[PDB]
Design a protein around this ligand. Structure first.
Ligand SMILES: *[C@@H]1O[C@H](CO)[C@@H](O[C@@H]2O[C@H](CO)[C@@H](O)[C@H](O)[C@H]2NC(C)=O)[C@H](O)[C@H]1NC(C)=O
Ligand SMILES: *[C@@H]1O[C@H](CO)[C@@H](O[C@@H]2O[C@H](CO)[C@@H](O)[C@H](O)[C@H]2NC(C)=O)[C@H](O)[C@H]1NC(C)=O
Ligand SMILES: *[C@@H]1O[C@H](CO)[C@@H](O[C@@H]2O[C@H](CO)[C@@H](O)[C@H](O)[C@H]2NC(C)=O)[C@H](O)[C@H]1NC(C)=O
Ligand SMILES: *[C@@H]1O[C@H](CO)[C@@H](O[C@@H]2O[C@H](CO)[C@@H](O)[C@H](O)[C@H]2NC(C)=O)[C@H](O)[C@H]1NC(C)=O
Ligand SMILES: *[C@@H]1O[C@H](CO)[C@@H](O[C@@H]2O[C@H](CO)[C@@H](O)[C@H](O)[C@H]2NC(C)=O)[C@H](O)[C@H]1NC(C)=O
Ligand SMILES: *[C@@H]1O[C@H](CO)[C@@H](O[C@@H]2O[C@H](CO)[C@@H](O)[C@H](O)[C@H]2NC(C)=O)[C@H](O)[C@H]1NC(C)=O
Ligand SMILES: CC(=O)N[C@@H]1[C@@H](O)[C@H](O)[C@@H](CO)O[C@H]1O
Ligand SMILES: CC(=O)N[C@@H]1[C@@H](O)[C@H](O)[C@@H](CO)O[C@H]1O
Ligand SMILES: *[C@@H]1O[C@H](CO)[C@@H](O)[C@H](O)[C@H]1NC(C)=O
Ligand SMILES: *[C@@H]1O[C@H](CO)[C@@H](O)[C@H](O)[C@H]1NC(C)=O
Ligand SMILES: *[C@@H]1O[C@H](CO)[C@@H](O)[C@H](O)[C@H]1NC(C)=O
Ligand SMILES: *[C@@H]1O[C@H](CO)[C@@H](O)[C@H](O)[C@H]1NC(C)=O
Ligand SMILES: *[C@@H]1O[C@H](CO)[C@@H](O)[C@H](O)[C@H]1NC(C)=O
Ligand SMILES: *[C@@H]1O[C@H](CO)[C@@H](O)[C@H](O)[C@H]1NC(C)=O
Ligand SMILES: *[C@@H]1O[C@H](CO)[C@@H](O)[C@H](O)[C@H]1NC(C)=O
Ligand SMILES: *[C@@H]1O[C@H](CO)[C@@H](O)[C@H](O)[C@H]1NC(C)=O
Ligand SMILES: *[C@@H]1O[C@H](CO)[C@@H](O)[C@H](O)[C@H]1NC(C)=O
Ligand SMILES: *[C@@H]1O[C@H](CO)[C@@H](O)[C@H](O)[C@H]1NC(C)=O
Ligand SMILES: *[C@@H]1O[C@H](CO)[C@@H](O)[C@H](O)[C@H]1NC(C)=O
Ligand SMILES: *[C@@H]1O[C@H](CO)[C@@H](O)[C@H](O)[C@H]1NC(C)=O
Ligand SMILES: *[C@@H]1O[C@H](CO)[C@@H](O)[C@H](O)[C@H]1NC(C)=O
Ligand SMILES: *[C@@H]1O[C@H](CO)[C@@H](O)[C@H](O)[C@H]1NC(C)=O
Ligand SMILES: *[C@@H]1O[C@H](CO)[C@@H](O)[C@H](O)[C@H]1NC(C)=O
Ligand SMILES: *[C@@H]1O[C@H](CO)[C@@H](O)[C@H](O)[C@H]1NC(C)=O
Ligand SMILES: *[C@@H]1O[C@H](CO)[C@@H](O)[C@H](O)[C@H]1NC(C)=O
Ligand SMILES: *[C@@H]1O[C@H](CO)[C@@H](O)[C@H](O)[C@H]1NC(C)=O
Lengths: 709, 709
RNA sequence: ACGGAAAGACCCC
RNA sequence: ACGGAAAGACCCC
């Protein structure tokens, strides 16, 4: 019970992976895999042909992925018997034309043919596909649209058709009807026309003709799409006068962005004449130097938007003059990637319905007092990627509804107890990737409802005691990628409800044996996940009482440390532990020590990963207490021998991974070789490929002369 | 030619190291080392006794170190025959009393007995020490100063005696004279008096009585130290009225700093009455809340200083009122670790002789225009560890004499081409550990004479083209610990005098085979040392022409990378290479690839370190071309066999390190065992300690059969 | 968040 | 700059 080229997924035997195995012969590779296989992933190999009965013994397949291969030839019959298949992925291969290879795929719901070199599809290729809802042909070499229509027009269930990034220049002009179709995309083609007369799409809600070339499109006819809800003309040069509001009375969303800033502002008179007559229009995406502040004022008259996106309007440098006041309907406003350096109380005085605002990636160094104060209903505010070194507390006065504040990748140099008084309802605060060096006491005291706090990728060295007081409801705390080293007595004081604590990639290191006067996690009584991966010089000597107080912990990650020494009984408090990972120390005895009886109390452990540690041997009876152990991985070590002793008492074992080791083809492994092939309870990854250590190779553990013992 | 517990130093055979080897029997440990040994270091062991002829076969010793052991017993005779020894280190042992050992130490210049538990020294212990110049008794349990004087007073050459950190409470009161003594320290004792009536030190130049407690010393008499040039009373409470200037007419330097800030300001009238009558006083160290600004003004009248140190004067918050004008003689001024947040050109208007100024570790967020402008002779300025996010360019107007600027560990968020206009003579610029994310073009253009630029530990991701334009004289560039990955076409252009480039601990990583259109080091015509260590994910696939143009290179550091893949002929340009380190990848085949003929051109390579790579095998003929190879280290790998094949053609070899491997006691290692024990041309570290791989151990490769082979 | 874990990857485009 | 290379370190004080 282990295959050659493929492995089962550890947490579902019905999923099979054969990824990056240089597979060239499809049939051989899958010949030894179970008949009960529902998901098979063969991504990233060198498969070239799909023969007439490729999946004979695999008729239970539901999901087949052949992404990133060299498939250029799929024989008729290839997918016969695959009547339960709902997904077929053929992305990134060498397919130039599509033939009648699809018989049997009577349940296929989605077919992905993106990223090939297709020019034509045979008229009858898709006939067996009576359930096909989604078809992707993006990234191909198609210029003949008539031929595609021939191939898809009779599909009974086809809802979404994607032709993005092809070479279609003209639409088709013989009368036809695709009645199931809801989504259609011509993005990134070279359309000269948008005349849909001869094409009836009664149920189309979403059309894209975005990014379609240099030549201006004048020939536009959309009457035949009466249900159309979103029209995407982003980066498409279209004479907007030839658009007709009469043909767009169901439109809810429009995208009129330029391709590049060079193209310049749109004529608001033209735009408003169109937009002003679309009574259902509520979303306008209006990007890339399409307008200035004054044009926003005009737009506000022509329209009644819920969502306006003004991103990448380079001529927006300040907004201080009632620009949005004729738009009180606004719920969501995006002003990201402009050139804004000043914004105040006068621009959005009347936006009392605004709940989401994106100001990220501008030139804000600061904001004046009461700038955001009219927005009494704001729930999401993003200021990410502004050159802000300091928070002007008064700019956020009265934002009592705010639930999420994103300040990631700003330049914030300091915060304190006065920084967040105005956000009593905040739930998520992202301070990641700033420049914060110390955390002062009470900095987050007002944030009574905070659920998630991100402080990662700062330069934190010093955490004052009571830094996190008031965070009674905090569930998640991310402190990854800082320079933290030791823990103060009352560091984690107010955090009794904390579920997740992430401290990986700091400098939490002990250079000698210690018994801490104050175990750092002692107050975290609800903690379920602890990350201590990759301390710069490894955690090294783990203090003997390091994990005291952590009886609720379920997952401990100590992987990627240069060294981890657990000499004593450090895991004794961890009675509810479910998953433990100590992988990647990379040179056994020097980098890893585990006391012989370290795992004794881990009677609920389900997962144990000790991979890439270059282990040379196993400690006797180390794992014998692990009753509930289901997944045991020793992948990428230097183990030479495994036997009944190592595996003693693992009653619940069902995945045991000893791939990437040095198992010797001698009698020492005779019990293992027979048991590993024969057990039906335990899966063993790539077992049938494990090579003999003999320098001559050309021989497998699996074929070991049993007779010699 | 290989020893058991010790090894020779790779670059001077006369140096022997025996560090952290758990040595307990000194004689046994040193029994196999050469008679030509001059430096012997046995630091960090558990040696307890030194028997009567411990160094019998080692009479050539000059430098002997027994630091960090458990020596409590040194027999009479221990150091016999050691007539060339000039240094003996016994620091950090268990010595409680010093007996009459030391016979034979007739050249000993320095004897270190610091960090023991010495209470007494026998009167005749140091009699053989006729050339002893320096004796350290710091960190011991000496309270009997009379007893110490008995032991040193007859030493004919004793110049320096250190008793810092002992328990001496009273001086001795029988008249004596140590005429050779120039330096004496009672720092960190518990002196209740400073009465030197009975102790004549006619040549004493330096006295420290620093850190002697709170109990105020009134009993002061120093007439007997007529040559005294420096008096250190830092942290010692002494009734300054009871000091006499009559007895201190040769004094050049004094330290009157407080112990803690609590002690408060000194009485400036008392201070000045003393100080004003010392005609040679040129250095005053004056720290820890000893004065305020106004006190500086009074001090300026009593004195004519060349160096004034006012560090840690917490009441110095602003200086804007002629504080220093009456001290125009100042050459060096330190004002670090005060609470300074404002300073301007009015405080130091007349300081035209100032050449060094330290403002580090204050609270400067900025400086006003022209603050530093009067200091026209300033050569050195430190502003380290101020919360400065941006440089006010006008604050430095006219500092044309400045040679070194230290801005390390400030909060600097941006600099540009206007940032360094005022420093045409700058030679060293330290910008490490700021918050700089991108480097703009022309940033260092004015610095025509710059030699060393430190930008380490910033957040550099983007280096604009021409970032280093104008740095034609640059010798050293430190860009370690940033986030660099790719370099613009001409980034390292114009740096043709660059000697040293440090790019370690960035993200310089290629995930596939590449042949770079523009190799980044191609213009570095003088580059001698290149550091590329520890890229976050390793350099991985080294581009085929990555080292193009580096024919002048002598040292290439590629260590500490998670992976290094050198598939082709990357090292072919490196014809002058002398040292190569690719250590610490940590798992042979997965993390390290070296083309079979990669070393073909390194005909001048002297040093090759391939350590800690978990290597299992050696590639045939990989090293056959290394004529000049002298040092070859394979320390800490998994090598099982070494033989004639590997060492083929290594004509210049003199050090071959295969310690920490897995060498098998079989016939495969017969050639190696015979060659390694017998060759006198090549040293092999710890050879006689190499154990047999049998799990029972208790056997050495050195004592291997031979009979069946 | 390549902070890859269905992980030890030459990861193309 | 433990950024330890006289290096793979339980590095105390
Ligand atoms: C191979 O295919 C499997 C499914 O057959 C992919 O599985 C998904 O994996 C992600 C995590 O990677 C999960 O969050 C999804 O729920 C999984 N989907 C299903 C249908 O199980 C798998 O990721 C693929 N792997 C690769 C490398 O291509
Ligand atoms: C119209 O089509 C454009 C062009 O594809 C869409 O742009 C993408 O939008 C997604 C989600 O916002 C981004 O993550 C992609 O990076 C965009 N791609 C490009 C090439 O810009 C645009 O979102 C569509 N407009 C609407 C309203 O759907
Ligand atoms: C601001 O939002 C509110 C709340 O969603 C809008 O009021 C609602 O409008 C719908 C449709 O007219 C009604 O059925 C609800 O009864 C209204 N709710 C309330 C609380 O009155 C309001 O129309 C929005 N304002 C603007 C300018 O569009
Ligand atoms: C052991 O003793 C030797 C001297 O015998 C020490 O050598 C010095 O090493 C430093 C660099 O670490 C050099 O810059 C000095 O020149 C060396 N001194 C001499 C006299 O050679 C060595 O550091 C000691 N090793 C340890 C770990 O204590
Ligand atoms: C004398 O004792 C003092 C005080 O203990 C020593 O000073 C300190 O040095 C330690 C050890 O490196 C540091 O951790 C402390 O920060 C220092 N404290 C103070 C008060 O400065 C001093 O080094 C000893 N002197 C000698 C020469 O042994
Ligand atoms: C007088 O003694 C003091 C206190 O012992 C010396 O202070 C030390 O100074 C050195 C050099 O600046 C520092 O590296 C140490 O941190 C200091 N040690 C302590 C314990 O403070 C002081 O330098 C001496 N004064 C003079 C004028 O030499
Ligand atoms: C970044 C950019 O291209 N800005 C353009 C500007 O060049 C042009 O004059 C104008 C035309 O409307 O639109 C704006
Ligand atoms: C020690 C510990 O926290 N164990 C928990 C226990 O508190 C809880 O009762 C149970 C679910 O009922 O899950 C487990
Ligand atoms: C794959 O292997 C089988 C078994 O040897 C062989 O019959 C068949 O020809 C191979 N198919 C391909 C694609 O070459
Ligand atoms: C399908 O299953 C049967 C039964 O094991 C087997 O004999 C047959 O060869 C299988 N077909 C292929 C091509 O794997
Ligand atoms: C379809 O048939 C043509 C012509 O026989 C062939 O070139 C092509 O490989 C086939 N396509 C696929 C993917 O099977
Ligand atoms: C379409 O083309 C553009 C340009 O390369 C690309 O960025 C985009 O991801 C492509 N979309 C698809 C679905 O292939
Ligand atoms: C289709 O249009 C609607 C708006 O009417 C939009 O919300 C939705 O995301 C669009 N779907 C796609 C996949 O373009
Ligand atoms: C908006 O900003 C500009 C530039 O600061 C200023 O001149 C103008 O008066 C402001 N507008 C109003 C009406 O406040
Ligand atoms: C608008 O800003 C001004 C000036 O900063 C402020 O005084 C005023 O209270 C603000 N108005 C409102 C309603 O928030
Ligand atoms: C160390 O070993 C030698 C010889 O094996 C022995 O004679 C000597 O007495 C030992 N020294 C000590 C201090 O135990
Ligand atoms: C010193 O060397 C002599 C002569 O080689 C040797 O016989 C003797 O054992 C050595 N003495 C000690 C104590 O190592
Ligand atoms: C002691 O030092 C001198 C000075 O170099 C040297 O010539 C002499 O040979 C040395 N003697 C010993 C004991 O090695
Ligand atoms: C000196 O002699 C004393 C008393 O006999 C003894 O306890 C001690 O070990 C000796 N000290 C040293 C360093 O030899
Ligand atoms: C110092 O000590 C001597 C005795 O040694 C004593 O007579 C004298 O009074 C003391 N000097 C002072 C200033 O107290
Ligand atoms: C001795 O004093 C002089 C100043 O007179 C000073 O330069 C030197 O550093 C001192 N030496 C020591 C070890 O303190
Ligand atoms: C400095 O001394 C003054 C009195 O001279 C005192 O008021 C103040 O507390 C001192 N500063 C500190 C930090 O102790
Ligand atoms: C110096 O600065 C302080 C604080 O800004 C100010 O109050 C004081 O008046 C200034 N004094 C002079 C002499 O300018
Ligand atoms: C300043 O330094 C010069 C040059 O060394 C010297 O001659 C002059 O006396 C100094 N001026 C004062 C006031 O010390
Ligand atoms: C001192 O600074 C003031 C204020 O910046 C400036 O006006 C003046 O020119 C400066 N004086 C000198 C001589 O540096
Ligand atoms: C390398 O070394 C030689 C001899 O030391 C020197 O003359 C030459 O300039 C160097 N070659 C290069 C490529 O810089």
């Amino acid at each position: 019970y282990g295959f050659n080229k493929c492995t089962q997924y550890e947490f579902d035997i019905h999923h099979v992976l054969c990824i990056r195995k240089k597979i060239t012969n499809l049939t051989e590779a899958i010949s030894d895999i179970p008949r009960y296989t529902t998901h098979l992933n063969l991504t990233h190999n060198e498969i070239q042909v799909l023969p007439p009965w490729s999946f004979t013994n695999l008729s239970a397949l539901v999901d087949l992925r052949l992404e990133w291969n060299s498939i250029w030839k799929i024989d008729e019959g290839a997918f016969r018997g695959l009547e339960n298949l709902t997904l077929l992925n053929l992305v990134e291969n060498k397919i130039q034309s599509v033939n009648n290879s699809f018989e049997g795929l009577s349940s296929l719901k989605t077919l992905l043919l993106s990223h090939n070199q297709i020019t034509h599809i045979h008229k009858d290729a898709f006939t067996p596909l009576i359930k096909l809802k989604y078809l992707s042909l993006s990234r191909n070499n198609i210029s003949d649209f008539s031929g595609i229509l021939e191939a898809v027009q009779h599909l009974p269930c086809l809802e979404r058709l994607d032709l993005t990034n092809n070479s279609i220049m003209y639409l088709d002009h013989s009368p036809r009807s695709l009645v199931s179709l809801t989504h259609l995309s011509f993005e990134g083609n070279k359309l000269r026309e948008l005349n849909f007369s001869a094409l009836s799409l009664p149920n189309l809600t979403n059309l894209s003709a975005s990014r379609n070339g240099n030549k201006v499109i004048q020939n536009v006819y959309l009457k035949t799409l009466p249900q159309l809800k979103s029209l995407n003309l982003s980066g498409t040069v279209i004479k907007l006068e030839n658009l007709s509001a009469k043909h767009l009375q169901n439109l809810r969303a429009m995208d009129l962005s330029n391709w590049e800033l060079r193209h310049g502002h749109l004529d608001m008179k033209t735009v408003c004449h169109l937009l002003g007559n679309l009574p259902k229009l509520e979303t306008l995406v209006f990007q890339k130097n399409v307008t200035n502040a004054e044009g926003i004022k005009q737009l506000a008259k022509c329209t009644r938007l819920l969502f306006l996106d003004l991103g990448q309007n380079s001529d927006l440098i300040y907004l201080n003059d009632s620009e949005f006041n004729a738009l009180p309907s606004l719920q969501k406003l995006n002003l990201n990637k402009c050139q804004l350096s000043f914004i105040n109380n006068r621009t959005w005085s009347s936006l009392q319905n605004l709940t989401s605002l994106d100001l990220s990636h501008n030139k804000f160094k600061s904001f004046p007092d009461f700038a955001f104060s009219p927005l009494k209903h704001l729930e999401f505010l993003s200021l990410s990627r502004n050159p802000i070194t300091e928070l002007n507390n008064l700019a956020f006065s009265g934002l009592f509804a705010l639930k999420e504040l994103n300040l990631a990748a700003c330049w914030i140099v300091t915060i304190d107890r006065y920084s967040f008084t105005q956000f009593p309802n905040l739930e998520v605060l992202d301070l990641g990737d700033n420049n914060i060096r110390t955390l002062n006491h009470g900095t987050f005291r007002p944030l009574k409802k905070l659920q998630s706090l991100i402080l990662s990728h700062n330069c934190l060295k010093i955490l004052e005691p009571n830094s996190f007081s008031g965070l009674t409801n905090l569930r998640s705390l991310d402190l990854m990628y800082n320079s933290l080293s030791y823990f103060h007595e009352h560091l984690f004081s107010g955090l009794e409800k904390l579920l997740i604590l992430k401290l990986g990639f700091n400098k939490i290191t002990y250079e000698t044996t210690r018994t801490l006067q104050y175990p750092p996690f002692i107050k975290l009584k609800s903690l379920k996940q602890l990350n201590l991966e990759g301390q710069r010089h490894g955690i090294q000597v783990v203090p003997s009482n390091f994990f005291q107080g952590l009886g609720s912990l379920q997952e401990l990650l100590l992987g990627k440390n240069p060294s981890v020494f657990l000499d004593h009984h450090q895991f004794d408090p961890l009675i509810n532990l479910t998953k433990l990972d100590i992988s990647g120390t990379k040179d056994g005895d020097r980098s890893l020590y585990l006391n012989a009886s370290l795992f004794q109390n881990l009677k609920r452990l389900k997962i144990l990963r000790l991979e890439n540690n270059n282990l040379e041997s196993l400690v006797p009876d180390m794992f014998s207490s692990l009753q509930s152990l289901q997944v045991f991985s020793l992948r990428f070590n230097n183990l030479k021998v495994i036997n009944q002793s190592h595996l003693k008492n693992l009653k619940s074992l069902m995945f045991f991974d000893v791939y990437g080791n040095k198992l010797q083809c001698t009698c020492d492994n005779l019990w293992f070789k027979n048991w590993s092939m024969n057990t039906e309870e335990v899966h063993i990854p790539f077992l049938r490929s494990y090579p003999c250590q003999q320098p001559g190779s050309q021989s497998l553990l699996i074929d070991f002369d049993d007779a010699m013992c």
